[PDB]
Amino acid sequence: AQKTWELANNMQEAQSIDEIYKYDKKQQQEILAAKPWTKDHHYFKYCKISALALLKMVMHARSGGNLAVMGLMLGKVDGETMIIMDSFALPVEGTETRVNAQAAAYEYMAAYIENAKQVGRLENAIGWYHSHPGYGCWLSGINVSTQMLNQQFQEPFVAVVIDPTRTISAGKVNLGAFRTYPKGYKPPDTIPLNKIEDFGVHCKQYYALEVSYFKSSLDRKLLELLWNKYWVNTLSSSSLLTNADYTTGQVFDLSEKLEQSEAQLGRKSEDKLAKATRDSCKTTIEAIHGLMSQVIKDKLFNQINI
Amino acid sequence: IIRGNQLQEFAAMLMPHQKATTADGSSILDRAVIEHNLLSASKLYNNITFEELGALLEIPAAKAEKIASQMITEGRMNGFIDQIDGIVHFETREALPTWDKQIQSLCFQVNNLLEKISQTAPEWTAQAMEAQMA
Amino acid sequence: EHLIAQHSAIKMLHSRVKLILEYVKASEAGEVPFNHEILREAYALCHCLPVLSTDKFKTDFYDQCNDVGLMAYLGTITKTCNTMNQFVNKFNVLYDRQ
Amino acid sequence: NLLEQFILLAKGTSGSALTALISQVLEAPGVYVFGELLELANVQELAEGANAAYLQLLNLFAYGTYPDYIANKESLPELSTAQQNKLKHLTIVSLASRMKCIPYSVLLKDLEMRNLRELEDLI
Amino acid sequence: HSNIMDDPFIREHIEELLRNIRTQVLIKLIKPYTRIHIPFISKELNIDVADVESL
């Protein structure tokens, strides 16, 4: 590998994967002083949840069984993205449809944050999460009310809803990050029927962020080196067939976005053509990545022994 | 696949009401075993003609097709029948999914073989791993 | 970020195969005792190495390659159109004929 | 593990008694690789005498196939119906290792079959 | 012929029947097949070849 891969890993220095784990205090102070989310309202669109935070939240949600559980999530912000670096449980007692956090959670919050600041946890609380055991991931009326209350005073705040029952029964995590609109502000204007069917009655009162996950380099190495079923599943992952339907849906809404961009460019100020081009480049890049994986597998397995 | 010669000792112990012919010359016993044979034969074949299907099940050409179409439409077996050329297609693999399955099996054999290597001569395996750096 | 994961998986497979080959060579030479079952399983592993080299597989692989090529073409066209719009917009305000 | 049973009973026997055990090995179902049995006093001294025919038969069952048996049918001893089925099964295994899509023409010629239906029953 | 094809309310509606049952038999029969002979359908429906094509 010599010079080629010597600086390509450089374990002495944090890689580009571990960049997000560094906390810049000055940048955080500058962004919270500027308050760019006050002018717009659909500002934050992405929620990046760390692997450990997602694992802890999922395990807490499942530990409650059929009873609701809740906790807080630490993190920061960067541009239009809300990054969640950790999560921590609350000592609350709830029923299958109601969790209150009466008097032991509020002392635990402050005491746990004070304890965490002692051992080098520079992040502050960024959100609150609770579980919906068996009725989807959505914001109820009181959930919307408390989200408004948290957002109006503690400005950066995202509500995460988990569903342990569907997570277990489907094999994939069911999670959703949401943000709400101010009281009596922004009433913007087959869709409504399904929208009220899967969301609550307050469909227009809150919006859903796009949830993505990340992990560090050490986490990636430990995970891929944990079991033998992780490199076997990489050499036979077979993309372009596991998620072909997602690709077709992306092409469809790409076509809709291209039509909108064509309509806009013929004559609020968003430059839709650039976003459509970015989406097209992204989906084409996933397609080419899948083809590269197939080519590598063919060269590795088929082209051996005549 | 159960042939008709190992069931003679089973039909003797059956209760008298279970040995009732269905007015077609075939008893109850050699109707469930026919359906079982056909369902098991769909796990060894990708397609089979009517004449050959009626060679291991008796029922040469006219009743094997009727039973085969009867098992389908009831959620009992997967397949479709091409009556023009007389062939029943059970399950066809799509090449590329088979390629990934065989890759998974090949990697499984690699892991299992190395497991026996480290289980038979553990002292040699440790020396080999350290020497892999050099 | 993707080729590195592929590289790590291939490196793990390469390490396993290298260790198996080293054991086979040691059995050939004499350092380790002759284990018939292990060598039989190694022979079976070697006999399966040309994985699915049939003509139908080749046709399906070519179909997949052509589909990805067309998906790349439609989208290379989109990027070129976006750059074209950008250049036209930048050119209009400079060489305006008013 | 079944071959290990015959191996221990064959650790000391020699002559006609040992050769009888060889026939039982080829007749026992589930014994398809005779690897450990072939590294015993058999190969050490069995190439001389009237029992050398069975030694050639054991080598044929471990490395050879059914076509390799027709060519030297005169030298090799007769085979019972149970033993012939095992030999035909190993012929299919050998063809499977070379190619993963075996045509019916190759199987019919090698196994000396004439009816397509009875070939599929064997497979 | 003395209890069914006597009143006008059953004899007139006996043609809507003897066709719904034949249609449902036809649908279930052709479920597993992909290429099926029309004369074969005629035997299973006890009607001539011409009427099977019309159905």
Swiss-Prot record, chain A:
Residues 47-184 form the MPN domain. One of its GO terms (molecular function) is metal-dependent deubiquitinase activity. It is found in: Cytoplasm, Cytosol; Nucleus; Cytoplasm, Perinuclear region; Cytoplasmic vesicle, Secretory vesicle, Synaptic vesicle. Zn(2+) binds at residues 130, 132, 143. The keyword Metal-binding applies. A motif (JAMM motif) lies at residues 130-143. Its main location: cytoplasm. Changing residue 130 to Q: Abolishes ability to deneddylate cullins, without affecting the 'Lys-63'-specific deubiquitination associated with the COP9 signalosome complex. Keywords: Acetylation, Cytoplasm, Cytoplasmic vesicle, Hydrolase, Metal-binding, Metalloprotease, Nucleus, Protease, Signalosome, Synapse, Zinc. Gene3D superfamilies: Cytidine Deaminase, domain 2. Belongs to the peptidase M67A family. CSN5 subfamily. This is COP9 signalosome complex subunit 5. It comes from Homo sapiens.
Curated annotation (Swiss-Prot), chain C:
Widely expressed. It is found in: Nucleus; Cytoplasm; Cytoplasm, Perinuclear region. Residues 1-98 are annotated as: Interaction with Vpr. Component of the COP9 signalosome complex (CSN), a complex involved in various cellular and developmental processes. The CSN complex is an essential regulator of the ubiquitin (Ubl) conjugation pathway by mediating the deneddylation of the cullin subunits of SCF-type E3 ligase complexes, leading to decrease the Ubl ligase activity of SCF-type complexes such as SCF, CSA or DDB2. The complex is also involved in phosphorylation of p53/TP53, c-jun/JUN, IkappaBalpha/NFKBIA, ITPK1 and IRF8, possibly via its association with CK2 and PKD kinases. Belongs to the peptidase M67A family. CSN6 subfamily. Component of the CSN complex, composed of COPS1/GPS1, COPS2, COPS3, COPS4, COPS5, COPS6, COPS7 (COPS7A or COPS7B), COPS8 and COPS9 isoform 1. In the complex, it probably interacts directly with COPS2, COPS4, COPS5, COPS7 (COPS7A or COPS7B) and COPS9 isoform 1. Interacts with the translation initiation factor EIF3S6. Interacts weakly with RBX1. Directly interacts with COP1 and 14-3-3 protein sigma/SFN. Interacts with ERCC6. (Microbial infection) Interacts with the HIV-1 protein Vpr. This is COP9 signalosome complex subunit 6.
UniProtKB/Swiss-Prot annotation, chain D:
This is COP9 signalosome complex subunit 7b. It is found in: Cytoplasm; Nucleus. Residues 1-123 form the PCI domain. Component of the COP9 signalosome complex (CSN), a complex involved in various cellular and developmental processes. The CSN complex is an essential regulator of the ubiquitin (Ubl) conjugation pathway by mediating the deneddylation of the cullin subunits of SCF-type E3 ligase complexes, leading to decrease the Ubl ligase activity of SCF-type complexes such as SCF, CSA or DDB2. The complex is also involved in phosphorylation of p53/TP53, JUN, I-kappa-B-alpha/NFKBIA, ITPK1 and IRF8/ICSBP, possibly via its association with CK2 and PKD kinases. The chain holds residues 10 to 132 of 264 of the full protein. Belongs to the CSN7/EIF3M family. CSN7 subfamily. It comes from the Eukaryota. Signal peptide: none annotated. Component of the CSN complex, composed of COPS1/GPS1, COPS2, COPS3, COPS4, COPS5, COPS6, COPS7 (COPS7A or COPS7B), COPS8 and COPS9 isoform 1. In the complex, it probably interacts directly with COPS1, COPS2, COPS4, COPS5, COPS6 and COPS8. Interacts with EIF3S6. (Microbial infection) Interacts with vaccinia virus protein C9L.
Swiss-Prot record, chain E:
This is COP9 signalosome complex subunit 2. Phosphorylated by CK2 and PKD kinases. It comes from the Eukaryota. It is found in: Cytoplasm; Nucleus. Component of the CSN complex, composed of COPS1/GPS1, COPS2, COPS3, COPS4, COPS5, COPS6, COPS7 (COPS7A or COPS7B), COPS8 and COPS9 isoform 1. In the complex, it probably interacts directly with COPS1, COPS4, COPS5, COPS6 and COPS7 (COPS7A or COPS7B). Specifically interacts with the ligand binding domain of the thyroid receptor (TR). Does not require the presence of thyroid hormone for its interaction. Interacts with CUL1 and CUL2. Interacts with IRF8/ICSBP1 and with nuclear receptors NR2F1 and NR0B1. Interacts with NIF3L1. Belongs to the CSN2 family. Coiled coil: none annotated. Essential component of the COP9 signalosome complex (CSN), a complex involved in various cellular and developmental processes. The CSN complex is an essential regulator of the ubiquitin (Ubl) conjugation pathway by mediating the deneddylation of the cullin subunits of SCF-type E3 ligase complexes, leading to decrease the Ubl ligase activity of SCF-type complexes such as SCF, CSA or DDB2. The complex is also involved in phosphorylation of p53/TP53, c-jun/JUN, IkappaBalpha/NFKBIA, ITPK1 and IRF8/ICSBP, possibly via its association with CK2 and PKD kinases.
